[PDB]
A paper describes a structure:
Among the most-studied ion channel proteins is the [name] family of tetrameric, six-transmembrane-segment, voltage-gated potassium (Kv) channels. As observed in other [name] and Kv2 structures, the voltage-sensing domains (VSDs) contain the membrane-spanning S1–S4 helixes while the S5, S6, pore helix and selectivity filter P-loop form the ion-conduction pore in a domain-swapped configuration. The selectivity filter of potassium channels consists of an array of four copies of the extended loop (the P-loop) formed by a highly conserved sequence, in this case TTVGYGD.
Dendrotoxins are peptide neurotoxins from mamba snakes that bind with nanomolar affinities and block potassium channels. By adding an excess of α-[name] to detergent-solubilized [name].2 protein we obtained a dataset of about 300,000 particles where an additional cap of density can be seen outside the pore. From our cryo-EM data we obtained a C1 map of α-[name] bound to [name].2s at 3.2 Å; this was done by extensive image processing and was helped by the larger size of α-[name] (59 residues as compared to 35 for ShK). The top and side views display the [name] on the negatively charged outer mouth of the [name].2 channel pore, with the density map fitted to the atomic model. In the selectivity filter of the toxin-bound channel a continuous density is seen to extend downward from the toxin to the boundary of IS1. This density is well modeled by the side chain of Lys5, with the terminal amine coordinated by the carbonyls of Y377 (Y28’). We conclude that block by α-[name] is occlusion of the selectivity filter through binding of the Lys5 terminal amine. In the selectivity filter a large density peak, presumably a K+ ion, is seen in a somewhat offset IS1 binding site; a second, larger K+ ion peak is seen in IS3. The different pattern of ion densities with [name] compared to CTx, having two rather than three peaks in the selectivity filter, implies that the interaction between the lysine side chain and the selectivity filter is in some way different in [name] compared to the other toxins.
Residue numbers in the entry:
A (entry chain B), C (entry chain C), D (entry chain D), E (entry chain E): 138 to 192, 206 to 274, 289 to 421
B (entry chain A): 1 to 59
Write the structure that this text describes.
């Protein structure tokens, strides 16, 4: 990547892009990491009943007001201010403005920055607000800028898209098969825990993944046989694409050194 | 109390439309409570009479 | 695989066999795929209590009549008519009609076609109808024609028959052993979760596969020791032939490229 | 593999030792396989409450009497007399009688034959009878004679003794660690599900193996952290020796071909 | 390492360092192994309600008195006396006392020795006592001196620190993501088992590891979808660095031979 060459844009770009270049760059990287971690902790703690009950305060998790009495709103505002400053500096110092919005890291930053401003504009349909609150957890992906392992995992996911799709397709086929089998095998009972095939989807996904929650369990002998087959076939189906994905991850992992 | 998972479970009325007077063991309340079972689905945390729920969730 | 050479059968065979040959072939492939998933969705949704209670419609899932009031029957008959049209075209355009019935991909079509016509002839024994409606789910395998990964999975299953049988045999031996051990270790208890060894089969199969449903759980010290041994032996037994089957799948998966 | 050389002992040894040598040898092998399977089925059905309650019949599973009214006793007697006849033929046709008792495939036959005669002798302590009835399940290992996969598994177990011991040692160390951690982290709770460290051994063994029956579950935050660490460390611990054992099994499996 | 060369320090060092050097050295090694096992058994049995209720004796597990009537305190005193004698001999016979404390094998001895003397000095805050009694279990790590497998595992853990950190980081990211998803997808429910995202952390760690206790289980359709995705992502993120850790373990394991 070429330097900005402006003699001041280049300095800011080096400061905010390559932490190893200088001491100030390293401290800026550490500050950004700590800010992201603080934002994640605040987002997770907003949902605790201690603050939720003893308080807008539940639809968004923070009270948007000029006074800004709520500590959660203060922390979120500070984190969003830091994120906005960082993104604006990077966008103003990016040598290629046309190609700036193509990198996945900048899209991640924009996704982590939008919901706060969307809520602020709205304050100036309820499921939309819940979805906006839910997508506020995507700032955990802002750590991919400072973590090399996260970048390796992202490259592995990009390269192993076909294997992931094959795993999903095989899982769906097995889930449909075993859900139908267990619904029809355990249908002539009043104590049946499978009311329909779409409900048996939960049992199929739980059994194939070897999770075994136990909330839904077959009772009839045919149900038990179907459950055995579901467990074995789920083990096999999961184990088929996983070695390919792991080989891709190892190739991208040891490529660094 | 650590009884069978049949006891560490939340009430699931089911997917049908009925009000069958069943009894389920609530661990949060540490006791057996009456509830309405729809007549299908549900989970193992379901009993016909409170005597058997108290039997095999308390002892 | 050569063209029929009839100057008219060849065109239909190319249209209905090679999607990449032309645009109409691709659109026919997409239509077939959409019909298959529509049939799968209809079959899964026919079991929901919303339509089942507000409806014969419970034994077969649809009402066969000239009026055709039931939407599920309409969807099923449209999917079956498309399947029959495709099968008739493929049978009348196949250059080798003698070898047509040997391919598994055509046996799958025949199996996905038969149960609807069997029910129609019957309405033109109760467990027989239930098992027929169960085998109605085998149209999910009709996606193997349009999906390459499903064909690789099928070839892997064909090639790894001995290893799959070995896995089943080892699982059976371990299940018998640990069911006997857990029954006899926990037999002198007034309230025991294992009435007999055949009922302990369920606990064994959910412990070896590490699903652990929790409906059947050992209580006595000997039962707990047997359960830990069952978990270890089951994970080892499963892990024994899984790498062989995975190697077979990977060989068939990288064979295309 | 020398023949007995008696001109009649050699024929008997060939008949009862090499199934592929002649048609009668294959018939004898199939008959023996069916006899072992019948014995296993009878042993499993002996425990069913249908026959157990509606019957001596509970201490040993069958009633030893001259009339022999019990069908289970008749089946067990037939299987045992076939086993004894086969063992006597093998012992009287073995070229090296001194080394006959060294092969584990014959120790299996003696172990499967003894308990019936032990009960017969004592018919003409209660836990001893239960232990005998438990070791009566070892006739499932008589299939190793007619199964190459079982012999391969036995050779793998013999070769991978050190790895199995290391797996057991690592699992025991992890179980002690996490049982102590979960007992002390959830000790100041009246509703704590861990009465003691030996009782937490069960939770540790089922969590490290990802079985998770749910009978014992941590409740406090420290208990939850301890449980997560236990699960992760158990996955790692089990995953360590398994590739070595699998490599041993693969070497012993592809050696035959 | 060279002998001390004192003609008496060297003899003691060889006696207490190389079990294969002489018969007395093997005797001392077996005695140390048995003493460590006895200490572990006594520590685990101190928590049984048979002795704990029939008792100070609950906060520390033993009662310090001159009479020493409690068998657990007698056993612990003997074990600690042996450990202190062995540590003193090894520290007085170590050729390089400056480098003696750098070895982790001697840090293990010091850590296993301190709690007893700390409680003894206190006899002559309550959570501190619980933490001390928790770290009292670290004498199980004293088996690493007499077992090569534990040394191999320690070297593997030392070499695989980056992969362990990557696994922990990926687990944390997935846990945060799926906890937020399952909380927001199952928030508008009175019977929701996820009061908050930090509470859903337990469900996330249980699902991703596929332990599946079932104490917290999704109920809404979005919850079920999130749970299935959580199981899949947890399986993948466990399977990513485990092969690298396994390769490290195998390299350190076959290096000895
Ligand atoms: K599980
Ligand atoms: K479970």
């Amino acid at each position: 990547r070429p330097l900005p060459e402006n003699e001041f844009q280049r300095q800011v770009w080096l400061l905010f892009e390559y932490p190893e270049s200088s001491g100030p760059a390293r401290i800026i990287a550490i500050v950004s990491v700590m800010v992201i971690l603080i934002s994640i902790v605040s987002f997770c703690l907003e949902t605790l009943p201690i603050f939720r009950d003893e308080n807008s305060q539940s639809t968004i998790g923070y009270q948007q007001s000029t006074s800004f009495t709520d500590p959660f709103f203060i922390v979120e505002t500070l984190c969003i201010i830091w994120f906005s400053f960082e993104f604006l500096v990077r966008f103003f110092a990016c040598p290629s403005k046309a190609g700036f919005f193509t990198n996945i890291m900048n899209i991640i930053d924009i996704v982590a920055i939008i919901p706060y401003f969307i809520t602020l504009g709205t304050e100036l349909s309820l499921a939309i607000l819940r979805v906006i609150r839910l997508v506020r957890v995507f700032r955990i992906f802002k750590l991919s800028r400072h973590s090399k392992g996260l970048q390796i995992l992202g490259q592995t996911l990009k390269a192993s898209m076909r294997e992931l799709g094959l795993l999903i397709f095989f899982l769906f086929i097995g889930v449909i098969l075993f859900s139908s089998a267990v619904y029809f095998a355990e249908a002539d009972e009043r104590d049946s825990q499978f009311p329909s095939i779409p409900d048996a989807f939960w049992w199929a996904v739980v059994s194939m993944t070897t999770v075994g929650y136990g909330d839904m369990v077959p009772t009839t002998i045919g149900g038990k046989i179907v459950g055995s087959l579901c467990a074995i076939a789920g083990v096999l189906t999961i184990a088929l694409p996983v070695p390919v994905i792991v080989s891709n991850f190892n190739y991208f992992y040891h490529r660094e050194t | 109390g650590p009884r069978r998972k049949l006891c560490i479970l939340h009430r699931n009325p089911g997917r049908c439309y009925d009000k069958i007077p069943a009894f389920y063991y609530n661990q949060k309340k540490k006791q057996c409570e009456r509830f309405d079972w729809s007549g299908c689905g549900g989970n193992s945390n379901r009993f016909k009479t409170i005597e058997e729920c108290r039997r095999t969730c308390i002892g």
